[PDB]
């Protein structure tokens, strides 16, 4: 599944397909050959895959004998590696290099990959599939904010003050459990419509966190929920921002079901849920009391 | 004042002075010569520079002959691609001479050829007042804040003309809101600054009225000041920036860093710029919404 | 378990794995070969292992015949030994040296290790696994301060003045026993949230040490507890500092469950508990009255 | 005033003078020539120098030819460089390499300084003077713990309730502000005796942060202060830990006035105050409301 | 048990182990081979054993044929014997010498040891195990002072003036017996904490020696005790000094239970008790009325 | 005034003069030539010299060739080790030439190689104001006196601010103490000097107040002079020193010995030095405690 952009020179077209075989299955190894859309600039398509491919396995070999004789890698490949590295990062972009390909002088002292090599590469790939860092699409950062502004805040407040405020009347929280519902698919308009739908299907009564006059400048946290056991349910409104940034991430001329963006937004919901699950295992005020529901409806 | 990573070849030097002078004196154009921090490896400091440098003007030249193509160095093209993927097509530019036979991934693409340099400077002036998606979400968080809070709240008030506080439906004759961007980002996020600023002024809590028809919508508790409500709030989303900043620029050092101060201030400026543009983007939030960037 | 960094030159790749065999099991021998992360500078990875590996067994052999002829050790290996020694210390970093490898002139008069050698090495390693000295992460120093500021202070005060001050009313301490609860896992935000959870789950009433006006500049010591026998329970707040310094110890780009830091932080809690247990056996005011609970929840 | 371990080769001598002069006169740059204390072995005194010397500017040169022909520096120079790198840190230790010294390949691709070079290094040292690293003896870590555990906590508590409790009297805090009193010299017994002396001298009365009944698993912070303007101020007790660490930093069989210890202890007090003074501008609740009276009495 | 440092040249490795056999059991014969700690200077380890090993059996043989031909002993062995003799003394350091090894010209006219020889050596070893002289650790001198300042003083005063002063009221001493309790293990902070514990567990009422105005400049001697028979009990506070000098005796980098110092401190309590028991058999004012309790709690 | 055992080889003689002159005239540098007392065996007088000599500056040279090597004499290394184990690493020093291939227990260790001699002299000046653990406990007894009496008494007075005498809890408004070290050590210990000095001035007994909470603590009866108490005391522990001196320097001779007078005076100086350092070592005993060394 995970989309991997394999960039290599036109003459390195048999190593490419060997590397495709070497990590065949559970990964959508896409080469640079089918990564170029018709009637599009090569740089545009390269940037665009950079915005789609999860990782990159660029292959640098003995070509373009250069001058400063020294068999360097390929200016196309070096450009591509720079681009993918700047967009994705060393964690996510990798440079297979054969025995002596004379890496750039910027790429010196940096251990690049040199068949078992692909094996270790794939293990590292899986290692980084459990890790969520910042990206142009702010799923990681949006999850961090959602958790350090609402989930952690609400969890701490309910743990602290034994009550939630429905309608100004206060009800008492004896058992506390909240479910973060990640919609299976984001609407163009955001999540507000799905949120209203979902809330209305269930009883999900609207109550807010109880404040005290001890802290004057403290904000309340309205939410929906079901000596009461409370099944709090929240659909992160921040996900709307995602469907906004996607419009900036991949500006699209046409209106229609785009697989590229369907995958991109599903991946970003994946990352949002992953980050939330991590950050729930983190704090004891949320450990075991916040559950995450992924791929809903 | 604007940081500009200029990168070229260890041989191609007085063009770098020439371009630094031509770009002028108001922007700070850091060369790659001093961009390499001590006891760090070149790729690593270059990635740091991408995280810091705003724009790029690398210089492709007739450096290395190859196999009979007079290409630039690999380092120049590598840095160019790294900044292109880090910053973006209009936050990174390439100064190629008449004949440098750039990579064929760059063929057919507009690459800048003294008047060239001032054209680039005008382009940079343009891109200074636009806003791109960034690795650390300053425009994305602004978009989310506007579409989720400010547009929502303004529409709510214009709709019901009334706002609710401890069940009292107080009437809103005149409406308007202010966005208070702190001058510096608090380590804990803007929660403590927010509490200070709500305590200082008479900023009382109030929630947007929720009609019973819309059973799956939540109101927006905020702080304000048939009455003229002097509404104003600190965007809490700024706390995220703080988080992101570390995941942007991790560092083992506890103290006053100029690089970080500049980066964090720039992101505050970008947030305010996006919000100020997005308020003219809508009628319900035009004239009814102001930005007090750099408060206290 | 204990992670041991075996550093040696690329041609000494059979001695490495032999030394791995000689101290196989109950130790996570990591070689320098798999100690280098991809797309990272060698110095960065070396420093980074220095911040993970508990010990080091660097192997210096007959290579790099140098000039001042004398078959010295390897500049990579010498650098690595210097680095690990400066970071860890002689107690923790060791230099296997073959019969005549011509140690540096700084390393003269210093008995370095020369298969039975590995045996003695392992005995010394076990000896030093029971010993806790200062480190970049201040688990040892934080425990020392926690014990010479709270545990010793509270123990002596209760032993001296036969009362603790709950609510301003004084209750009398007939039998005295306090439990230092080390959480099994530290939260990002510190221990305050775990502390509040734990205190609220148990009765853990909040009372403080009784002061007297005889000494004006003496500070009180609030704590939680259950002619009363008192089951004092304390979760060291100082552990928060650890999770703080860890952020500086291993600055991490990504958000996610990192085994490296999970092990590092578990090890630092290990050291904190070990130092505390030592320091309880130390003073008679605490001997037998302070117990330590490790790996809690 | 700043101590600077300059280390080079027993042949590479007048360069050491040039660099000492170029670094200037305001900093004390101790050469490796006099760094070797009598009746001690070289490694041991070098480790002591790491414990003492703040920054490092070793000098790699074309000393020893080798066989990997490679004109390497001496093994001693690289060993010292690594030892200081692992002891101090990458930006508290620097290497002055000539045009061609083919440094170890763990250092390849890494920025090593090549009179203007020396003053660039001096500017770096001026930079690193106002930052704070994690240290073997916890001066920044203890400051972080003190701030996050006491000063941030106390300031937030007071700003919240605006009231503080003493023998059950909830006295009101109209104006709030605190001072951090760092003693000029660290008392042997820790700062307990200095703290009691200073509390006795002035009218510093005890007072605890008010604890609301909602937060049943939180402890107040008894402190010493001076709707009223409270002139709050306290000596950080954590400083006592430093004393302990100092011995575990610099053990010595000698009872008397040691300049090495006086300098070390003073530097750690300065680093603590520097970290705290930066961390107070780091936060709103502790900005202007918190001052540092470093070197009192 | 008793640790005996057997120092000999590297080629004299069969006589060493023969002498180990020849005086096997009730002695912990440690050779110079395992007396060298890793990553430590040879001189450091030698001095350190000098501070651990009770005795020494240094072996001087026919090696280092020197010039002034004459087969002298070994510069290593001669150094070691000089060091151990200067630190311990002839009573405690011994030099086995073979038939004609040409002792130094300083060691002339001095009868050194020449299998039955080991027998006599061991008899002398037991003789000196029954003898307590001055040392770096002042157990002997501290006991002497404790007995010529408190035990003898108090014994004479009670024998003389038939009363002890409790609270200013005088109680009459018909039968007199005092027990000197040596704690089984000394705390870092001294004995004060053990002293308070022990005193408080028993009734041990606090009374002092009765002075008279006949002698104006006579000091009182407070103590604790149970026409009254009086079971005086005293824990020598001077033992605190021991745990102080130990810190100077063996300055330790690390925090943890050290067997070397555990043994050293147990040995020093042994010597203190032995000296006290001797000095009680000495004076008739203390004979039979003062008992010594060793290895307490 | 400072005694310095200089020891060398029966061949290396004018070097001994040279070093004696270089060390100067203010310190008394006794050679090994006259260190050998008549009708005593060499080891015995050397041990006596260790008991007397404060510092050592032996001289290793190219005396005896060997086979393993131009080592110094066995006697020189033996004396060096004897003083090292008797005095300490920084109270004994070795002056080795460029090539003397010292024992391999001393390999890799810093041994001094005219400027060398004055560097050693500066080191000796350093070690003059530090204090090591000694065979006869002058620093150890000072540590015990400070931690057991002076720190304790000062802390007690600062705590209760009151002291008790025949049940009267008299108030201590201003506190301060003096430590009276006798010029010469009385044979019986300082008990008789203490009684004389208490008789001369009006030094009345007074005990630190003991609160009932601490049921297993003893007060400190002492002699003093809301009132300004002119506290001062002779450290009784000095009597121990007397004892130790014999167990340090046994001798069958009754009379005025310069060696003993120097030794006992040096130990009194070392006691006072340790105490004077340990009072600035602590706040509760700083300015409130003074040392009147060599009284009467
Ligand atoms: N059920 C519930 N979820 C909450 C609440 N507050 C925050 N969240 C969740 O946390 C996410 C990020 O909040 P933020 O970082 O503090 O940053 C927020 C904040 O600055 C502002 N904002 C959002 N909601 C409110 C509000 O109710 N009152 C005020 N005064 N500001 C709000 O817009 C930023 C982004 O908002 P979002 O896109 O909506 O995404 C929100 C939203 O998904 C709450 O009160 N109730
Ligand atoms: N239950 C309880 N535990 C205590 C208390 N005081 C100290 N501890 C524990 O001892 C550890 C180290 O205390 P510290 O070295 O004196 O160093 C402390 C101290 O200088 C200061 N501090 C902490 N608590 C207080 C307080 O309540 N009052 C005042 N004036 N200062 C405090 O912050 C430093 C670090 O604090 P921590 O990270 O929290 O870590 C604290 C904390 O885990 C107490 O009063 N009650
Ligand atoms: N129960 C009891 N034991 C006693 C008493 N006096 C001495 N000892 C014991 O005798 C040891 C040696 O006393 P010191 O040689 O005269 O030398 C002593 C003395 O000069 C001084 N000192 C100790 N206690 C007192 C005191 O109560 N009053 C005065 N004026 N000086 C004291 O400190 C020196 C070392 O004291 P330490 O380490 O404690 O060790 C003391 C202590 O263990 C006493 O009055 N009651």
Numbering used by the authors:
A (entry chain D), C (entry chain B), D (entry chain A), E (entry chain F): 2 to 69, 73 to 118, 130 to 241, 252 to 322
B (entry chain C): 2 to 68, 73 to 118, 130 to 241, 252 to 322
F (entry chain E): 2 to 69, 74 to 118, 130 to 241, 252 to 322
What wording appears in the published article?
The TIR domains are not as well resolved in the main double-filament class, probably owing to conformational heterogeneity, and we therefore focused structural analysis on the single-fibre filaments. In the SfSTING–c-di-GMP complex, individual dimeric units adopt a two-fold symmetric conformation and form the basic repeating building block of the filament structure (right). Compared with the modelled open apo state and partially closed 3′,3′-cGAMP-bound conformations, recognition of the signal from the correct nucleotide, c-di-GMP, induces an inward rotation of the SfSTING β-strand ‘lid’ region of about 25° and about 9° respectively and results in formation of a tightly closed complex. The primary STING filament interface occurs along two surfaces that pack between adjacent SfSTING dimeric units and drive lateral head-to-head oligomerization.
To define the molecular basis of STING filament formation, we reconstituted signalling of the S. faecium TIR–STING (SfSTING) antiphage effector in vitro and used single-particle cryo-EM to determine the structure of the activated complex. In each SfSTING dimer unit, the canonical V-shaped STING CBD is positioned above two TIR enzymatic NADase domains that dock against the base of the receptor.
